[PDB]
Amino acid sequence: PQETLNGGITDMLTELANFEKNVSQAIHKYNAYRKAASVIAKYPHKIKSGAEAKKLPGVGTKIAEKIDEFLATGKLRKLEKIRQDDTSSSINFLTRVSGIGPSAARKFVDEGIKTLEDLRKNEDKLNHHQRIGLKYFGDFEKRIPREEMLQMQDIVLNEVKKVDSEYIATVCGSFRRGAESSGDMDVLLTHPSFTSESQPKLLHQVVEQLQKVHFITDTLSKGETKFMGVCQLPSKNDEKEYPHRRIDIRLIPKDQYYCGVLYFTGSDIFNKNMRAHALEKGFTINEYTIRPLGVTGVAGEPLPVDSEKDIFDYIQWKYREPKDRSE
DNA sequence: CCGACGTCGCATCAGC
DNA sequence: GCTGATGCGA
DNA sequence: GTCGG
Ligand SMILES: Nc1nc2c(ncn2[C@H]2C[C@H](O)[C@@H](COP(=O)(O)NP(=O)(O)OP(=O)(O)O)O2)c(=O)[nH]1
Ligand SMILES: [Mg+2]
Ligand SMILES: [Mg+2]
Ligand code: NA
Ligand code: NA
């Protein structure tokens, strides 16, 4: 609809979801709430009763009751109570630091560490990832205008070709879907000498080069196929500095390029129903392959993939442009 | 009544 | 030292 | 928390 049609309900469900994940550490209740928030978020009428909402898939008795209470009062007593709870709301908040999950947040709060100030007082107790998440807390929650995304892409493609002209770098994620803004940058990397059957340092050449031209500023994690770090556009002689941005760089086998491009172009919710159709057509799709499903449900051998739409044709789907892969 | 609820790479911890 | 398990983000 | 075997 418009996100506001049942906004209060979906806001409430989302807040309930976060407390289940971060505080209660009940990941399945977390998803149950988000599943209900999502299906309500697309329901094109103003909900007037919990029973009305209960018609939708993912909405059960407990949520139906909560909707009734919300409609009657404009609030949930449980939600009002946990909001003012110092321990629970502190644990919930600290998980907004990249690197601090439900477990780390609990440990910090248990030993009296509850705010960003407390975190800054206590570098000793943070790991490498958490320090950077702390250092760029504000920046990581800013969004990236597409104009900056294009400027970031310019640098990536240029430096990647410079190291080795036979690389292929493809920016995926929300950018490739043509979104007006993005939360981060995801880059897919491929090279002729790295395929599933079979040069050592392919990912770390590229990382090193982007560090050399001062694009990449920090490293959260780095393996041989997956890089997670921080980047920043260069600013002009007098102009204000750009925010620091999250950037992932992944090295995928060349003969699995399109399955990776599809997978990491998303969106996550597009992917989850694309594999979902696939699981009902006798197919299965991961980030590497599309495999046929045998009579007893067992997956056979990887199929030939030479384009993104090959995957689409396999599974009864008209090809869809990245632009329409919002869900 | 009760088990399922995607999967993955990397960092770090538990334990031998 | 190591392997396996768990946390984390995605 | 919701769904379904
Ligand atoms: N396996 C898996 N993949 C996910 C998940 N979530 C997202 N992706 C897979 C598909 C995601 O689309 C994608 C690329 O990751 P992002 O940058 O995190 N998401 P995007 O670029 O769409 O949004 P944004 O503008 O906020 O950055 O990777 C997930 O929970 N699980
Ligand atoms: Mg992204
Ligand atoms: Mg990303
Ligand atoms: Na329902
Ligand atoms: Na976090």
mmCIF file of C-alpha atoms (C1' of nucleotides) and ligand atoms in Angstrom:
data_model
loop_
_atom_site.group_PDB
_atom_site.id
_atom_site.type_symbol
_atom_site.label_atom_id
_atom_site.label_comp_id
_atom_site.label_asym_id
_atom_site.label_seq_id
_atom_site.Cartn_x
_atom_site.Cartn_y
_atom_site.Cartn_z
ATOM 1 C CA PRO A 1 0.000 0.000 0.000
ATOM 2 C CA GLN A 2 1.582 3.072 1.437
ATOM 3 C CA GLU A 3 3.905 2.035 4.290
ATOM 4 C CA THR A 4 1.632 4.046 6.623
ATOM 5 C CA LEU A 5 -1.621 2.143 6.083
ATOM 6 C CA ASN A 6 -0.875 -0.215 8.973
ATOM 7 C CA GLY A 7 2.401 1.409 9.995
ATOM 8 C CA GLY A 8 1.647 1.378 13.710
ATOM 9 C CA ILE A 9 1.005 -2.356 13.556
ATOM 10 C CA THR A 10 4.100 -3.163 11.479
ATOM 11 C CA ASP A 11 6.218 -0.799 13.594
ATOM 12 C CA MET A 12 4.996 -2.678 16.654
ATOM 13 C CA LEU A 13 5.695 -6.081 15.100
ATOM 14 C CA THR A 14 9.190 -4.992 14.057
ATOM 15 C CA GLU A 15 10.029 -3.716 17.540
ATOM 16 C CA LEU A 16 8.772 -7.012 18.965
ATOM 17 C CA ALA A 17 10.956 -8.828 16.434
ATOM 18 C CA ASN A 18 14.102 -6.997 17.535
ATOM 19 C CA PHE A 19 13.594 -7.752 21.230
ATOM 20 C CA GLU A 20 13.132 -11.440 20.427
ATOM 21 C CA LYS A 21 16.387 -11.522 18.457
ATOM 22 C CA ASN A 22 18.594 -9.234 20.529
ATOM 23 C CA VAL A 23 17.277 -9.719 24.072
ATOM 24 C CA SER A 24 15.373 -13.011 24.281
ATOM 25 C CA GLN A 25 17.685 -14.630 21.716
ATOM 26 C CA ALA A 26 14.740 -16.437 20.140
ATOM 27 C CA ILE A 27 15.643 -16.171 16.460
ATOM 28 C CA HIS A 28 12.531 -18.011 15.254
ATOM 29 C CA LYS A 29 10.142 -15.640 17.021
ATOM 30 C CA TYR A 30 12.169 -12.846 15.439
ATOM 31 C CA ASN A 31 11.436 -14.183 11.956
ATOM 32 C CA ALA A 32 7.813 -14.963 12.823
ATOM 33 C CA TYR A 33 7.257 -11.299 13.676
ATOM 34 C CA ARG A 34 9.064 -10.031 10.574
ATOM 35 C CA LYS A 35 7.123 -12.445 8.372
ATOM 36 C CA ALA A 36 3.901 -11.069 9.846
ATOM 37 C CA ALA A 37 5.143 -7.488 9.581
ATOM 38 C CA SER A 38 5.924 -8.031 5.899
ATOM 39 C CA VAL A 39 2.610 -9.619 4.875
ATOM 40 C CA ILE A 40 0.648 -6.977 6.775
ATOM 41 C CA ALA A 41 2.879 -4.351 5.177
ATOM 42 C CA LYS A 42 1.501 -5.338 1.755
ATOM 43 C CA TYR A 43 -2.136 -5.830 2.753
ATOM 44 C CA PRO A 44 -4.047 -3.075 0.894
ATOM 45 C CA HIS A 45 -6.691 -2.255 3.526
ATOM 46 C CA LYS A 46 -6.647 -0.646 6.964
ATOM 47 C CA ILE A 47 -6.850 -3.510 9.456
ATOM 48 C CA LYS A 48 -9.815 -3.136 11.810
ATOM 49 C CA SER A 49 -9.439 -6.317 13.871
ATOM 50 C CA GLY A 50 -6.931 -9.004 14.813
ATOM 51 C CA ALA A 51 -9.241 -11.621 13.318
ATOM 52 C CA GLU A 52 -9.074 -9.745 10.019
ATOM 53 C CA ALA A 53 -5.284 -9.788 10.190
ATOM 54 C CA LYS A 54 -5.310 -13.459 11.196
ATOM 55 C CA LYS A 55 -6.504 -14.336 7.683
ATOM 56 C CA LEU A 56 -3.043 -13.559 6.311
ATOM 57 C CA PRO A 57 -0.305 -16.232 6.196
ATOM 58 C CA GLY A 58 2.116 -15.729 9.081
ATOM 59 C CA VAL A 59 -0.423 -14.078 11.369
ATOM 60 C CA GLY A 60 -1.597 -16.333 14.189
ATOM 61 C CA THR A 61 -3.529 -16.091 17.447
ATOM 62 C CA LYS A 62 -0.893 -14.360 19.595
ATOM 63 C CA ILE A 63 -0.284 -11.587 17.049
ATOM 64 C CA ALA A 64 -4.033 -11.276 16.446
ATOM 65 C CA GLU A 65 -4.456 -10.525 20.156
ATOM 66 C CA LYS A 66 -1.677 -7.932 20.125
ATOM 67 C CA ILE A 67 -3.273 -6.196 17.149
ATOM 68 C CA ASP A 68 -6.551 -6.084 19.084
ATOM 69 C CA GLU A 69 -4.805 -4.492 22.072
ATOM 70 C CA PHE A 70 -3.025 -1.997 19.822
ATOM 71 C CA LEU A 71 -6.248 -0.993 18.068
ATOM 72 C CA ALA A 72 -8.066 -0.633 21.387
ATOM 73 C CA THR A 73 -5.366 1.312 23.228
ATOM 74 C CA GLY A 74 -2.778 2.523 20.711
ATOM 75 C CA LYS A 75 -0.091 0.525 22.503
ATOM 76 C CA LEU A 76 1.140 -2.789 23.906
ATOM 77 C CA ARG A 77 1.674 -3.065 27.668
ATOM 78 C CA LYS A 78 4.530 -5.544 27.194
ATOM 79 C CA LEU A 79 6.215 -3.239 24.686
ATOM 80 C CA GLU A 80 5.761 -0.215 26.959
ATOM 81 C CA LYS A 81 7.275 -2.184 29.836
ATOM 82 C CA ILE A 82 10.372 -3.488 28.054
ATOM 83 C CA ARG A 83 11.062 -0.058 26.536
ATOM 84 C CA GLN A 84 11.558 1.399 30.004
ATOM 85 C CA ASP A 85 13.534 -1.639 31.153
ATOM 86 C CA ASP A 86 17.132 -0.454 31.401
ATOM 87 C CA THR A 87 18.774 -3.852 30.897
ATOM 88 C CA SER A 88 16.678 -4.993 27.930
ATOM 89 C CA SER A 89 16.668 -1.693 26.028
ATOM 90 C CA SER A 90 20.427 -1.387 26.549
ATOM 91 C CA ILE A 91 21.043 -4.868 25.145
ATOM 92 C CA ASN A 92 18.747 -4.096 22.217
ATOM 93 C CA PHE A 93 20.575 -0.846 21.469
ATOM 94 C CA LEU A 94 24.156 -2.145 21.638
ATOM 95 C CA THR A 95 23.378 -4.626 18.851
ATOM 96 C CA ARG A 96 23.198 -1.621 16.517
ATOM 97 C CA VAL A 97 26.991 -1.657 16.639
ATOM 98 C CA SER A 98 28.299 -3.782 13.772
ATOM 99 C CA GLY A 99 30.097 -6.715 15.372
ATOM 100 C CA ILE A 100 28.024 -6.724 18.547
ATOM 101 C CA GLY A 101 25.326 -9.379 18.397
ATOM 102 C CA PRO A 102 22.763 -10.544 20.995
ATOM 103 C CA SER A 103 25.444 -12.459 22.919
ATOM 104 C CA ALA A 104 28.108 -9.741 23.094
ATOM 105 C CA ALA A 105 25.481 -7.121 23.936
ATOM 106 C CA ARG A 106 24.275 -9.219 26.864
ATOM 107 C CA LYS A 107 27.811 -9.659 28.193
ATOM 108 C CA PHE A 108 28.583 -5.933 27.993
ATOM 109 C CA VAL A 109 25.372 -4.880 29.743
ATOM 110 C CA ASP A 110 25.897 -7.547 32.416
ATOM 111 C CA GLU A 111 29.188 -5.876 33.362
ATOM 112 C CA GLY A 112 27.658 -2.397 33.345
ATOM 113 C CA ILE A 113 28.597 -1.441 29.785
ATOM 114 C CA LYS A 114 25.409 -0.040 28.271
ATOM 115 C CA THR A 115 26.101 2.979 26.042
ATOM 116 C CA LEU A 116 28.457 4.004 23.238
ATOM 117 C CA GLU A 117 30.253 6.067 25.877
ATOM 118 C CA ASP A 118 30.763 2.919 27.944
ATOM 119 C CA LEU A 119 32.084 1.200 24.817
ATOM 120 C CA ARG A 120 34.524 4.036 24.114
ATOM 121 C CA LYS A 121 35.751 3.738 27.706
ATOM 122 C CA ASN A 122 36.440 0.049 27.153
ATOM 123 C CA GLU A 123 38.451 -0.680 23.989
ATOM 124 C CA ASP A 124 40.065 -3.585 25.877
ATOM 125 C CA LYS A 125 36.860 -5.609 25.784
ATOM 126 C CA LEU A 126 36.015 -5.106 22.105
ATOM 127 C CA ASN A 127 37.364 -7.187 19.229
ATOM 128 C CA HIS A 128 38.659 -5.719 15.964
ATOM 129 C CA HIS A 129 35.307 -5.760 14.141
ATOM 130 C CA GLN A 130 33.500 -4.169 17.091
ATOM 131 C CA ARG A 131 35.997 -1.302 17.375
ATOM 132 C CA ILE A 132 35.405 -0.295 13.760
ATOM 133 C CA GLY A 133 31.645 -0.720 14.116
ATOM 134 C CA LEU A 134 31.948 1.583 17.113
ATOM 135 C CA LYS A 135 34.269 4.034 15.348
ATOM 136 C CA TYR A 136 31.862 4.430 12.421
ATOM 137 C CA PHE A 137 28.556 3.871 14.246
ATOM 138 C CA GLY A 138 26.922 6.990 12.819
ATOM 139 C CA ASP A 139 28.349 6.556 9.321
ATOM 140 C CA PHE A 140 27.259 2.921 8.989
ATOM 141 C CA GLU A 141 23.662 4.015 9.580
ATOM 142 C CA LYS A 142 23.811 6.720 6.917
ATOM 143 C CA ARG A 143 22.606 5.811 3.434
ATOM 144 C CA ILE A 144 24.554 6.065 0.184
ATOM 145 C CA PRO A 145 23.157 8.217 -2.640
ATOM 146 C CA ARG A 146 23.425 6.529 -6.047
ATOM 147 C CA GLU A 147 25.662 9.339 -7.316
ATOM 148 C CA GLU A 148 28.246 8.334 -4.718
ATOM 149 C CA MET A 149 27.639 4.662 -5.539
ATOM 150 C CA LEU A 150 28.571 5.383 -9.159
ATOM 151 C CA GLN A 151 31.684 7.261 -8.031
ATOM 152 C CA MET A 152 32.591 4.336 -5.782
ATOM 153 C CA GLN A 153 32.024 1.968 -8.704
ATOM 154 C CA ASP A 154 34.278 4.083 -10.940
ATOM 155 C CA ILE A 155 37.163 3.593 -8.514
ATOM 156 C CA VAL A 156 36.539 -0.132 -8.053
ATOM 157 C CA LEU A 157 36.379 -0.972 -11.769
ATOM 158 C CA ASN A 158 39.426 1.193 -12.490
ATOM 159 C CA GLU A 159 41.741 -0.176 -9.792
ATOM 160 C CA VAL A 160 40.596 -3.750 -10.412
ATOM 161 C CA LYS A 161 41.435 -3.526 -14.119
ATOM 162 C CA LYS A 162 44.760 -1.918 -13.189
ATOM 163 C CA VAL A 163 45.946 -4.896 -11.122
ATOM 164 C CA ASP A 164 44.918 -7.323 -13.851
ATOM 165 C CA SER A 165 42.905 -6.476 -16.968
ATOM 166 C CA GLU A 166 41.426 -9.989 -16.982
ATOM 167 C CA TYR A 167 39.479 -9.509 -13.756
ATOM 168 C CA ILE A 168 35.763 -8.872 -13.923
ATOM 169 C CA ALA A 169 34.274 -6.715 -11.188
ATOM 170 C CA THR A 170 30.498 -6.466 -10.921
ATOM 171 C CA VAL A 171 28.742 -4.301 -8.350
ATOM 172 C CA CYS A 172 25.614 -6.132 -7.235
ATOM 173 C CA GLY A 173 23.191 -5.707 -4.348
ATOM 174 C CA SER A 174 20.742 -2.804 -4.347
ATOM 175 C CA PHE A 175 22.965 -0.838 -6.732
ATOM 176 C CA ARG A 176 22.554 -3.280 -9.614
ATOM 177 C CA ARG A 177 18.811 -3.212 -8.949
ATOM 178 C CA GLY A 178 19.020 0.492 -9.773
ATOM 179 C CA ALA A 179 18.025 1.746 -6.331
ATOM 180 C CA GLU A 180 18.208 5.509 -5.761
ATOM 181 C CA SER A 181 20.216 4.791 -2.615
ATOM 182 C CA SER A 182 22.040 1.902 -0.954
ATOM 183 C CA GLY A 183 23.054 0.735 2.509
ATOM 184 C CA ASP A 184 26.447 -0.477 1.311
ATOM 185 C CA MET A 185 28.406 -1.774 -1.680
ATOM 186 C CA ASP A 186 28.714 -5.412 -2.738
ATOM 187 C CA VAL A 187 31.321 -6.279 -5.350
ATOM 188 C CA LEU A 188 31.649 -9.605 -7.145
ATOM 189 C CA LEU A 189 35.079 -10.597 -8.410
ATOM 190 C CA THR A 190 35.978 -13.146 -11.069
ATOM 191 C CA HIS A 191 39.178 -14.213 -12.826
ATOM 192 C CA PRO A 192 39.933 -16.881 -15.493
ATOM 193 C CA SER A 193 42.396 -18.765 -13.267
ATOM 194 C CA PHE A 194 39.864 -19.305 -10.473
ATOM 195 C CA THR A 195 37.108 -21.777 -11.304
ATOM 196 C CA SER A 196 35.461 -24.556 -9.275
ATOM 197 C CA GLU A 197 37.922 -27.093 -10.657
ATOM 198 C CA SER A 198 40.915 -24.883 -9.948
ATOM 199 C CA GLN A 199 47.195 -17.836 -9.007
ATOM 200 C CA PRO A 200 47.116 -17.733 -5.152
ATOM 201 C CA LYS A 201 46.304 -14.212 -4.012
ATOM 202 C CA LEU A 202 43.514 -13.005 -6.418
ATOM 203 C CA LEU A 203 41.351 -11.395 -3.740
ATOM 204 C CA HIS A 204 44.188 -9.862 -1.838
ATOM 205 C CA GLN A 205 45.693 -8.139 -4.883
ATOM 206 C CA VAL A 206 42.498 -6.163 -5.353
ATOM 207 C CA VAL A 207 42.102 -5.327 -1.657
ATOM 208 C CA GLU A 208 45.714 -4.146 -1.441
ATOM 209 C CA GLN A 209 45.307 -1.889 -4.479
ATOM 210 C CA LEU A 210 42.157 -0.246 -3.128
ATOM 211 C CA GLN A 211 44.067 0.372 0.100
ATOM 212 C CA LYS A 212 46.923 1.906 -1.884
ATOM 213 C CA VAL A 213 44.722 4.579 -3.465
ATOM 214 C CA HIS A 214 43.123 5.194 -0.060
ATOM 215 C CA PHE A 215 39.696 3.891 -1.026
ATOM 216 C CA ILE A 216 39.626 1.045 1.503
ATOM 217 C CA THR A 217 40.355 2.376 4.993
ATOM 218 C CA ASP A 218 39.559 -0.519 7.349
ATOM 219 C CA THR A 219 39.276 -4.316 7.386
ATOM 220 C CA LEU A 220 36.523 -6.113 9.311
ATOM 221 C CA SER A 221 37.303 -9.579 7.987
ATOM 222 C CA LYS A 222 39.329 -10.952 5.091
ATOM 223 C CA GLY A 223 39.619 -14.483 3.788
ATOM 224 C CA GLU A 224 40.581 -15.774 0.358
ATOM 225 C CA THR A 225 37.103 -15.523 -1.180
ATOM 226 C CA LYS A 226 35.369 -12.956 1.029
ATOM 227 C CA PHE A 227 36.364 -9.442 2.089
ATOM 228 C CA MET A 228 34.403 -7.224 4.471
ATOM 229 C CA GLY A 229 35.652 -3.708 5.136
ATOM 230 C CA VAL A 230 35.277 0.058 5.036
ATOM 231 C CA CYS A 231 35.791 2.488 2.165
ATOM 232 C CA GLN A 232 35.604 6.231 1.548
ATOM 233 C CA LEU A 233 35.459 8.492 -1.500
ATOM 234 C CA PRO A 234 38.197 11.119 -1.804
ATOM 235 C CA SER A 235 37.138 14.703 -1.063
ATOM 236 C CA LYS A 236 38.200 17.927 -2.780
ATOM 237 C CA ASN A 237 40.804 20.445 -1.593
ATOM 238 C CA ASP A 238 38.405 22.382 0.643
ATOM 239 C CA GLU A 239 35.251 20.267 0.567
ATOM 240 C CA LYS A 240 33.859 18.407 3.585
ATOM 241 C CA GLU A 241 34.885 14.754 4.006
ATOM 242 C CA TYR A 242 32.624 11.902 2.791
ATOM 243 C CA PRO A 243 31.098 9.376 5.219
ATOM 244 C CA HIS A 244 32.835 6.007 5.629
ATOM 245 C CA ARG A 245 30.976 3.179 3.890
ATOM 246 C CA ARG A 246 30.615 -0.586 4.273
ATOM 247 C CA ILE A 247 31.974 -2.578 1.337
ATOM 248 C CA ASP A 248 32.060 -6.315 0.646
ATOM 249 C CA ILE A 249 34.209 -7.924 -2.046
ATOM 250 C CA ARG A 250 33.672 -11.550 -3.047
ATOM 251 C CA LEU A 251 35.763 -13.801 -5.286
ATOM 252 C CA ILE A 252 33.540 -16.353 -7.022
ATOM 253 C CA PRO A 253 34.649 -19.118 -9.435
ATOM 254 C CA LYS A 254 34.304 -17.891 -13.029
ATOM 255 C CA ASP A 255 32.183 -20.866 -14.090
ATOM 256 C CA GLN A 256 29.721 -19.993 -11.310
ATOM 257 C CA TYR A 257 29.608 -16.261 -12.044
ATOM 258 C CA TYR A 258 25.920 -15.918 -12.936
ATOM 259 C CA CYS A 259 24.614 -17.892 -9.955
ATOM 260 C CA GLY A 260 26.632 -15.573 -7.738
ATOM 261 C CA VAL A 261 25.501 -12.456 -9.576
ATOM 262 C CA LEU A 262 21.887 -13.586 -9.227
ATOM 263 C CA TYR A 263 22.281 -14.529 -5.558
ATOM 264 C CA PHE A 264 24.038 -11.331 -4.483
ATOM 265 C CA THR A 265 21.953 -9.015 -6.666
ATOM 266 C CA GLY A 266 18.947 -10.025 -4.610
ATOM 267 C CA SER A 267 16.881 -8.765 -3.153
ATOM 268 C CA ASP A 268 17.005 -11.174 -0.202
ATOM 269 C CA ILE A 269 13.228 -11.483 -0.348
ATOM 270 C CA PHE A 270 13.317 -11.909 -4.131
ATOM 271 C CA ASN A 271 15.880 -14.680 -3.661
ATOM 272 C CA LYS A 272 13.951 -16.438 -0.953
ATOM 273 C CA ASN A 273 10.859 -16.694 -3.159
ATOM 274 C CA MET A 274 12.909 -17.423 -6.315
ATOM 275 C CA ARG A 275 14.514 -20.493 -4.684
ATOM 276 C CA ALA A 276 11.103 -21.209 -3.178
ATOM 277 C CA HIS A 277 9.444 -21.517 -6.630
ATOM 278 C CA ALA A 278 12.491 -23.553 -7.640
ATOM 279 C CA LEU A 279 11.971 -26.019 -4.729
ATOM 280 C CA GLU A 280 8.483 -26.679 -6.127
ATOM 281 C CA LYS A 281 9.549 -27.205 -9.717
ATOM 282 C CA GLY A 282 12.065 -29.934 -8.996
ATOM 283 C CA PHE A 283 15.031 -27.582 -8.782
ATOM 284 C CA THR A 284 17.239 -26.000 -6.132
ATOM 285 C CA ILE A 285 19.369 -22.862 -6.254
ATOM 286 C CA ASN A 286 22.265 -21.681 -4.118
ATOM 287 C CA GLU A 287 24.909 -19.028 -4.792
ATOM 288 C CA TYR A 288 27.017 -21.515 -6.749
ATOM 289 C CA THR A 289 24.698 -23.741 -8.757
ATOM 290 C CA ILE A 290 21.217 -24.691 -9.843
ATOM 291 C CA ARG A 291 20.709 -28.413 -9.278
ATOM 292 C CA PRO A 292 17.863 -30.643 -10.481
ATOM 293 C CA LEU A 293 15.827 -32.345 -7.767
ATOM 294 C CA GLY A 294 15.506 -36.095 -8.051
ATOM 295 C CA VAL A 295 12.325 -37.988 -7.476
ATOM 296 C CA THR A 296 13.026 -38.483 -3.801
ATOM 297 C CA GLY A 297 14.041 -34.867 -3.385
ATOM 298 C CA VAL A 298 17.808 -35.338 -3.612
ATOM 299 C CA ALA A 299 19.798 -32.788 -5.631
ATOM 300 C CA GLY A 300 21.858 -34.045 -8.560
ATOM 301 C CA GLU A 301 24.625 -32.323 -10.510
ATOM 302 C CA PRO A 302 25.079 -28.601 -11.340
ATOM 303 C CA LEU A 303 23.503 -27.542 -14.647
ATOM 304 C CA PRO A 304 25.121 -25.462 -17.398
ATOM 305 C CA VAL A 305 24.650 -21.746 -16.704
ATOM 306 C CA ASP A 306 25.722 -19.164 -19.285
ATOM 307 C CA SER A 307 23.387 -16.310 -18.351
ATOM 308 C CA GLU A 308 21.095 -15.132 -15.555
ATOM 309 C CA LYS A 309 17.975 -16.020 -17.539
ATOM 310 C CA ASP A 310 19.173 -19.600 -18.032
ATOM 311 C CA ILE A 311 18.382 -19.971 -14.345
ATOM 312 C CA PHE A 312 15.002 -18.316 -14.953
ATOM 313 C CA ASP A 313 14.058 -20.535 -17.892
ATOM 314 C CA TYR A 314 14.987 -23.655 -15.920
ATOM 315 C CA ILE A 315 12.460 -22.854 -13.178
ATOM 316 C CA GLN A 316 9.267 -21.762 -15.013
ATOM 317 C CA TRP A 317 9.951 -18.021 -14.660
ATOM 318 C CA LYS A 318 9.824 -15.225 -17.204
ATOM 319 C CA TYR A 319 13.129 -13.359 -16.946
ATOM 320 C CA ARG A 320 13.098 -10.460 -14.516
ATOM 321 C CA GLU A 321 15.320 -7.403 -14.685
ATOM 322 C CA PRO A 322 17.359 -6.513 -11.560
ATOM 323 C CA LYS A 323 15.104 -3.464 -11.321
ATOM 324 C CA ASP A 324 12.029 -5.596 -10.615
ATOM 325 C CA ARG A 325 13.778 -7.919 -8.160
ATOM 326 C CA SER A 326 12.672 -5.909 -5.133
ATOM 327 C CA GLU A 327 10.766 -9.053 -4.164
ATOM 328 C "C1'" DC B 1 1.528 -32.739 20.150
ATOM 329 C "C1'" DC B 2 5.747 -31.210 18.368
ATOM 330 C "C1'" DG B 3 9.596 -30.362 14.941
ATOM 331 C "C1'" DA B 4 10.852 -26.866 11.234
ATOM 332 C "C1'" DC B 5 12.069 -22.375 10.662
ATOM 333 C "C1'" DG B 6 18.298 -21.258 4.090
ATOM 334 C "C1'" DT B 7 22.932 -21.134 3.866
ATOM 335 C "C1'" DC B 8 27.605 -19.346 3.896
ATOM 336 C "C1'" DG B 9 32.687 -17.269 4.974
ATOM 337 C "C1'" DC B 10 35.342 -15.521 8.590
ATOM 338 C "C1'" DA B 11 36.753 -14.494 13.558
ATOM 339 C "C1'" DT B 12 36.915 -16.169 17.867
ATOM 340 C "C1'" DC B 13 36.187 -19.328 21.677
ATOM 341 C "C1'" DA B 14 36.056 -24.133 23.935
ATOM 342 C "C1'" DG B 15 38.488 -28.009 24.653
ATOM 343 C "C1'" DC B 16 41.827 -31.745 23.776
ATOM 344 C "C1'" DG C 1 49.625 -26.889 18.743
ATOM 345 C "C1'" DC C 2 45.224 -28.623 16.797
ATOM 346 C "C1'" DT C 3 39.795 -29.484 15.586
ATOM 347 C "C1'" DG C 4 35.197 -28.506 16.316
ATOM 348 C "C1'" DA C 5 31.652 -25.152 17.961
ATOM 349 C "C1'" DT C 6 29.711 -20.838 18.323
ATOM 350 C "C1'" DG C 7 29.041 -15.732 17.180
ATOM 351 C "C1'" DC C 8 28.324 -12.589 13.603
ATOM 352 C "C1'" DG C 9 26.619 -10.372 9.397
ATOM 353 C "C1'" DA C 10 24.617 -11.153 5.441
ATOM 354 C "C1'" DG D 1 5.243 -17.264 16.957
ATOM 355 C "C1'" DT D 2 3.217 -19.707 13.066
ATOM 356 C "C1'" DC D 3 2.563 -23.506 10.354
ATOM 357 C "C1'" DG D 4 1.663 -28.133 9.258
ATOM 358 C "C1'" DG D 5 3.124 -33.241 9.483
HETATM 359 N N1 LIG E 1 22.009 -15.638 2.280
HETATM 360 C C1 LIG E 1 21.539 -14.419 2.546
HETATM 361 N N2 LIG E 1 21.683 -13.419 1.660
HETATM 362 C C2 LIG E 1 21.214 -12.185 1.914
HETATM 363 C C3 LIG E 1 20.593 -11.955 3.080
HETATM 364 N N3 LIG E 1 20.221 -10.693 3.116
HETATM 365 C C4 LIG E 1 20.599 -10.172 1.971
HETATM 366 N N4 LIG E 1 21.254 -11.049 1.182
HETATM 367 C C5 LIG E 1 22.005 -11.529 -0.125
HETATM 368 C C6 LIG E 1 21.024 -10.793 -0.944
HETATM 369 C C7 LIG E 1 21.101 -9.196 -0.564
HETATM 370 O O1 LIG E 1 20.350 -8.413 -1.474
HETATM 371 C C8 LIG E 1 22.457 -9.262 -0.979
HETATM 372 C C9 LIG E 1 23.649 -8.309 -1.111
HETATM 373 O O2 LIG E 1 23.694 -7.944 0.263
HETATM 374 P P1 LIG E 1 23.195 -6.530 0.927
HETATM 375 O O3 LIG E 1 24.043 -5.359 0.631
HETATM 376 O O4 LIG E 1 23.186 -6.829 2.506
HETATM 377 N N5 LIG E 1 21.554 -6.368 0.658
HETATM 378 P P2 LIG E 1 21.149 -5.261 -0.525
HETATM 379 O O5 LIG E 1 22.280 -4.838 -1.389
HETATM 380 O O6 LIG E 1 19.918 -5.856 -1.391
HETATM 381 O O7 LIG E 1 20.546 -4.012 0.331
HETATM 382 P P3 LIG E 1 21.379 -2.732 0.843
HETATM 383 O O8 LIG E 1 21.091 -1.513 -0.174
HETATM 384 O O9 LIG E 1 20.734 -2.307 2.264
HETATM 385 O O10 LIG E 1 22.836 -2.970 0.953
HETATM 386 O O11 LIG E 1 23.026 -10.573 -0.509
HETATM 387 C C10 LIG E 1 20.418 -12.898 3.997
HETATM 388 O O12 LIG E 1 19.840 -12.639 5.055
HETATM 389 N N6 LIG E 1 20.893 -14.184 3.760
HETATM 390 MG MG MG E 2 24.015 -3.957 -0.587
HETATM 391 MG MG MG E 3 26.261 -5.670 1.701
HETATM 392 NA NA NA E 4 -3.084 -16.629 9.629
HETATM 393 NA NA NA E 5 25.389 -5.541 15.685
#
